[PDB]
Structure 1
Amino acid sequence: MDSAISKEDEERYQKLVTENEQLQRLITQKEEKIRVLRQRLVERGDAKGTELN
């Protein structure tokens, strides 16, 4: 509908949001499970790990 914003800018954006949807979900899968590991690591004292940077 826009004379400047063509299919070009649209497709680039659409596909981009698609990318966002994919991997943010892939994160959450691991996160929720690792989250439990986090608590388990709390008891181990591994909660922080080794962050010297």
Structure 2
Amino acid sequence: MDSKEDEERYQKLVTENEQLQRLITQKEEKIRVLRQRLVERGDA
């Protein structure tokens, strides 16, 4: 029909893009601190 059909798909996907980036960062952030907590004990 029109671009709207795919644009409605688009806007949903960009919406997941927002959350995905959020979590990747949150996980990566956790990963960062999580290393530091173990290393200074496990390896020192």
The TM-score range, normalised by the shorter chain, is: 0.5 to 0.7
Q: Which moved more, 1:15-24 or 1:29-38?
A: 29-38
Unmatched tracts of structure 2, length 5 or more? none
Higher relative contact order (CA 8 A, sep 6+): 1
Identical-residue share of aligned pairs (%): 100
Structure 1 residue 39, shift from structure 2 partner: 3.9
Structure 1 residues 37 and 13: alpha-carbon distance in aligned structure 2, compared to 1, 3 A threshold: same
Structure 1 residue 9, shift from structure 2 partner: 1.4
Aligned length: 44
Rg (Cα) greater in structure:
1
Instruction: Give the alignment's TM-score, normalised by structure 2.
Output: 0.61
